[PDB]
Amino acid sequence: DSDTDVEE
Amino acid sequence: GLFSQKSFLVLGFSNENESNIANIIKENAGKIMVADYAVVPLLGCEVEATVGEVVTNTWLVTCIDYQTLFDPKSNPLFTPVPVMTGMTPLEDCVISFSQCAGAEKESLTFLANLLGASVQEYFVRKSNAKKGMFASTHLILKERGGSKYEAAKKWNLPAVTIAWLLETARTGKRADESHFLIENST
Amino acid sequence: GLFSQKSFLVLGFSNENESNIANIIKENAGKIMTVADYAVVPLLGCEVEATVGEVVTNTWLVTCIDYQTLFDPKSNPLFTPVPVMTGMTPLEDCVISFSQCAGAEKESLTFLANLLGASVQEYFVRKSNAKKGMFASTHLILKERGGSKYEAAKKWNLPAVTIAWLLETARTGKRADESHFLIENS
């Protein structure tokens, strides 16, 4: 996963 | 070339879409027209003519992206995928993916939308209107690992396998998440 | 159990810390101690006079558990003691961000980077911002070519390095040549 893309 | 001495038959695509696929096949050394392969849509179509095996453009594009010729049986998007059409079992779901890239991810996102889910890039715990993010309901992935998975465990949200998606797709009925937790996958 | 048929020595921690660690191993079917399969030691290591199969870190232990997978300790330099040239701080003016790292692996890299005198930042920014409380970044440490931060580093002309850069810095006591560890060459 090149991006974490996790929020809150 | 990669598709060296391989004959193909493109079926079930639009007027243009047929051509783009036929192009990318020759562009990697395959022949168009008994054929070694029959390329059909993700959902499969009418295959009358006898071929080696029916694969999808998802298989095709995937193969080229890795420069590897994968076995069609080694992934369920590589061959036509059963879907119970007319059903939107995923109606209220907001789905993130993890550990999925390119063609595979386009296809899974395709199926997810089909079932009436919405898909987002970001796994999101709380809706934020200013940011434009809706709270996620499901994580879909492959192994245990990574930050998306860790958020799912911490947030108490279902982080399930791809097979959850494809089973819901097959039956037109929402698969029981608890039967497809990556937490229990071996 | 994950650690089933495996025996453990827990060496190098405080009384309270090893009680906790031991309980975690037990909760995962391992036995605490003949020759033990594993000696669990802190990241930086410690004297192990007993004879064991292999010496492994708490970072190994925890990762293994977090991902319910018995990773081969040799698959990651953080899984076995990491040699650090004691009391040296060759990264004293660095501001480091990690990309593509999660959980215990990330807590361990963080510890190392701080230990070498670096400051570690959640956000990769090119310019300091006092109101926001963020400092300009100087390094990005990542696993593979790709992702938002990687693109930013390329754009901002900041070095993007593999983890080996960090560990080589720690082993020597001296700031490794960033140009020998660029993510572009791995």
Swiss-Prot record, chain C:
Induction entry: Up-regulated during the S phase of the cell cycle. Up-regulated by E2F1 and interferon.
Q: Which domain of life is it from?
A: Eukaryota
Tell me which stretches of the chain form a coiled coil: none
**Modification(s) after translation:** Phosphorylated on serine and threonine residues in response to X-ray irradiation. Ubiquitinated and degraded by the proteasome. X-ray irradiation reduces ubiquitination. Deubiquitinated by USP13; leading to TOPBP1 stabilizion and activation of the ATR-TOPBP1 axis pathway.
Tissue-level expression reads:
Highly expressed in heart, brain, placenta, lung and kidney.
Family stated for the protein in its record: Belongs to the TOPBP1 family.
Stated name of the protein = DNA topoisomerase 2-binding protein 1
Origin species: Homo sapiens (Human)
Which region of the full protein is contained in this chain?
A: 551 to 741 of 1522
